[PDB]
Amino acid sequence: PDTVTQYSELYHDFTTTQVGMHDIVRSFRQTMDQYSTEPGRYRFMGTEAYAESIDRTVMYYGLPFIQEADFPFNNYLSMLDTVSGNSVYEVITSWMENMP
Amino acid sequence: PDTVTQYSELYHDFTTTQVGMHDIVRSFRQTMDQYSTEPGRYRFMGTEAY
């Protein structure tokens, strides 16, 4: 453990995505709802969470009875260092099948 | 680790109260809300966590 200094040498189970984090993002959406009541002046909320699994990114969409981000920002096409027909297909189908 | 057999010898960070558990309890409350709309017939939900 004297040599564990790089971030990729640990599993970050205690410092990222803890119980209660999504409720803080939902209270940000509630604060912005008081400025969205006038028609044509809806206020947008997007979230950025990168280097993440697709099943954790999709949780920022919320639930059908609980509002959260309007969308989380999708950067999975930006992470393609080389392009191919199979690699573009799996990025498009991962987002469309996993999002609610 | 061959002798770790009692439940009190581990910290249960991965098997109790995970991310997403409270949302399952909130969806139980939403199911019971469809039977609570008539006045005087509210449906109670209590949770036990000791």
From Swiss-Prot, chain B:
Q: Which organs or tissues contain this protein?
A: Expressed in the brush border membrane in the kidney (at protein level). Predominantly expressed in the kidney, small intestine and pancreas. Weakly expressed in liver.
Query: Where in or outside the cell is it found?
Result: Cell membrane; Apical cell membrane
Changing residue 5 to A does what? Answer: In CSNU; reduction in amino acid transport activity
The subunit field of the Swiss-Prot or TrEMBL record says:
Disulfide-linked heterodimer composed of the catalytic light subunit SLC7A9 and the heavy subunit SLC3A1. The heterodimer is the minimal functional unit. Assembles in non-covalently linked heterotetramers (dimers of heterodimers) and higher order oligomers; the oligomerization is mediated by SLC3A1 likely to prevent degradation in the endoplasmic reticulum and facilitate heteromer trafficking to the plasma membrane. Disulfide-linked heterodimer composed of the catalytic light subunit SLC7A13 and the heavy subunit SLC3A1.
Related illness:
Cystinuria: An autosomal disorder characterized by impaired epithelial cell transport of cystine and dibasic amino acids (lysine, ornithine, and arginine) in the proximal renal tubule and gastrointestinal tract. The impaired renal reabsorption of cystine and its low solubility causes the formation of calculi in the urinary tract, resulting in obstructive uropathy, pyelonephritis, and, rarely, renal failure. Hypotonia-cystinuria syndrome: Characterized generalized hypotonia at birth, nephrolithiasis, growth hormone deficiency, minor facial dysmorphism, failure to thrive, followed by hyperphagia and rapid weight gain in late childhood.
Question: What does it do?
Answer: Acts as a chaperone that facilitates biogenesis and trafficking of functional transporter heteromers to the plasma membrane. Associates with SLC7A9 to form a functional transporter complex that mediates the electrogenic exchange between cationic amino acids and neutral amino acids, with a stoichiometry of 1:1. SLC7A9-SLC3A1 transporter has system b(0,+)-like activity with high affinity for extracellular cationic amino acids and L-cystine and lower affinity for intracellular neutral amino acids.
Q: What is this protein's name?
A: Amino acid transporter heavy chain SLC3A1
**Species assigned in the record:** Homo sapiens
Ranked from the top, the taxonomy reads: Eukaryota, Metazoa, Chordata, Craniata, Vertebrata
